Design a binder for this molecule. Structure first.
Ligand code: HEM
Ligand SMILES: O=C(CCCCn1ccnc1)N[C@@H](Cc1ccccc1)C(=O)O
Length: 451
């Protein structure tokens, strides 16, 4: 099988010692094709980029979720929360079973009011900008998505629109995520040069644990019965085991949700708005839908469901720049991938989602183009062609949450503002564990529609 250039004993590892590893891997996939082996010291994985192979990798009878090295490092603070759990860990299925009703379309109806609360704050923020002011899009999207998950997750107001300095939890979570990402490119991770990084990581873990544990303890102590994820986790019983999540796992779930609803979800909005302002006809069609559907000062859940084209904009943004750009699988047994590449039990696969989503055999030669209309009919999209939310039982539990939040907010943004790519912004995708259009800025001229 193909493999990119190697650096002696470091194998391919230095290829990921780059500011933009996902984009680096995409370029490697561009050159090497649908599958390449990627070796690092004591690690081998295969990056899959074609729907042809990924549809097989998505076969849960043959492949299970693997914790990528990145997820393994995030597990140091997301614990056995859902995204850093192995499927075979008791706490995975337990939490999966308990949390699924909390994340369904039907649950979104109950989160909707809280999402609107934050979305209106975003609108009001942009409504209150002065004429020459501009919007730092990823920053504001993250304010929105963090606040939304804080409010819907555990009735906690990060009040991100009231600050420029991040919440202590977010400082530690961002710095812990950064430490996880840095631990990946390190050729010598045991070197004492990183000893302070390891110590800071420990301090960041303890910070996140303490603040979330206190959030949990505070909720148990107040006895308050909100309808947020925290309440469901405190009160939920896994139908299978009959057991609730323990407080430790609930903390990990909360940390996981905060990670996920932070820049992973804000990236979706950031990229969506990026593609909208880069595609005025798409923007206009999306804004026309927003105006036609969002006839009330506050969007209802039902109206957000009616933002079909906005939904397609988000999918198309997810297609081009999936904010969770890769997921790892391992072969449950010896198997043959694509009739060509024999895998041994335990062999790892990486699904390079942005490259999958550029599979010209699926999307046509207009792959780079932002055409939300690609998603008019999900039935017309081949199986496993579109995997921004991962796969199978290990798919994104937050998908409905992310999409509802994004659709609501994008709908309101499109209703309330005309957007100007006033700097003719050059897409620069900053890579952390997610992707964001770094420095993406717009001007939003209010249509002066009241809320
Ligand atoms: C646009 C936004 C989002 C995207 C693109 C996204 C993407 C993904 C992907 C690709 C996976 C699979 C990871 C893997 O297989 O290793 C995943 C899993 C997961 N996501 Fe998301 N996510 C988003 C937002 C959210 C939100 C808002 C939440 C919760 C508040 C969330 C919670 C989770 C959880 C708990 C899992 C693990 C589910 C399980 O394995 O049982 N995500 N997500
Ligand atoms: O696999 C992940 C981790 C992304 C996890 C997405 N996600 C899901 C839920 N929450 C987040 N990165 C990819 C790409 C990469 C490589 C080196 C450094 C950074 C990134 C890989 O390791 O090859």
């Amino acid at each position: 099988m193909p493999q990119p250039k190697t650096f002696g004993e470091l194998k391919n590892l230095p290829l990921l010692n780059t500011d933009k590893p996902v984009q680096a891997l995409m370029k490697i996939a561009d050159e090497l094709g649908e599958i390449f082996k990627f070796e690092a010291p004591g690690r081998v994985t295969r990056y899959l980029s074609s729907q042809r192979l990924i549809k097989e990798a998505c076969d849960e009878s043959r492949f299970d979720k693997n914790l990528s090295q990145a997820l393994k490092f995030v597990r140091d603070f997301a614990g056995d929360g859902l995204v850093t759990s192995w499927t075979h860990e008791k706490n995975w299925k337990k939490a999966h079973n308990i949390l699924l009703p909390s994340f369904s379309q039907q649950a979104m109806k109950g989160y909707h009011a809280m999402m609107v609360d934050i979305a209106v704050q975003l609108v009001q923020k942009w409504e209150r900008l002065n004429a020459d002011e501009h919007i730092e899009v990823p920053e504001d999207m993250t304010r929105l998505t963090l606040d939304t998950i804080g409010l819907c997750g555990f009735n906690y107001r990060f009040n991100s629109f009231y600050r420029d300095q991040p919440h202590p939890f977010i400082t530690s979570m961002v710095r812990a995520l950064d430490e996880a990402m840095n631990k990946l490119q390190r050729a010598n991770p045991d070197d004492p040069a990183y000893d302070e990084n390891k110590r800071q990581f420990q301090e960041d873990i303890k910070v996140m644990n303490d603040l979330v544990d206190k959030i949990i303890a505070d909720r148990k102590a107040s006895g308050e019965q909100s309808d947020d994820l925290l309440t469901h986790m405190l009160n939920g019983k896994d139908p299978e085991t009959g057991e609730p999540l323990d407080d430790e796992n609930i903390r990990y779930q909360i940390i996981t949700f905060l990670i996920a609803g932070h820049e992973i979800t804000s990236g979706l909005l950031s990229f969506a708005l990026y593609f909208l302002v880069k595609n005025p006809h798409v923007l206009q069609k999306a804004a026309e839908e927003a105006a036609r559907v969002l006839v009330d000062p506050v969007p209802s859940y039902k109206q957000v469901k009616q933002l079909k084209y906005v939904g397609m904009v988000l999918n198309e943004a997810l297609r081009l720049w999936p904010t969770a750009p890769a997921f790892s699988l391992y072969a449950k047994e010896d198997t043959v991938l694509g009739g060509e590449y024999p895998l041994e039990k335990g062999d790892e696969l990486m699904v390079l989602i942005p490259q999958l989503h550029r599979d010209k055999t699926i999307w046509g030669d207009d792959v780079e183009e932002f055409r939300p209309e690609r998603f008019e009919n999900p039935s017309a999209i081949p199986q496993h062609a579109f995997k921004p939310f991962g796969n199978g039982q290990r798919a994104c539990i937050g998908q409905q949450f992310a999409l509802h939040e994004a659709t609501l907010v994008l709908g309101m943004m499109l209703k309330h503002f005309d957007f100007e790519d006033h700097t003719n912004y050059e897409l620069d995708i900053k890579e952390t564990l997610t992707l964001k259009p770094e420095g993406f800025v717009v001007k939003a001229k209010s249509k002066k529609i009241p809320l």
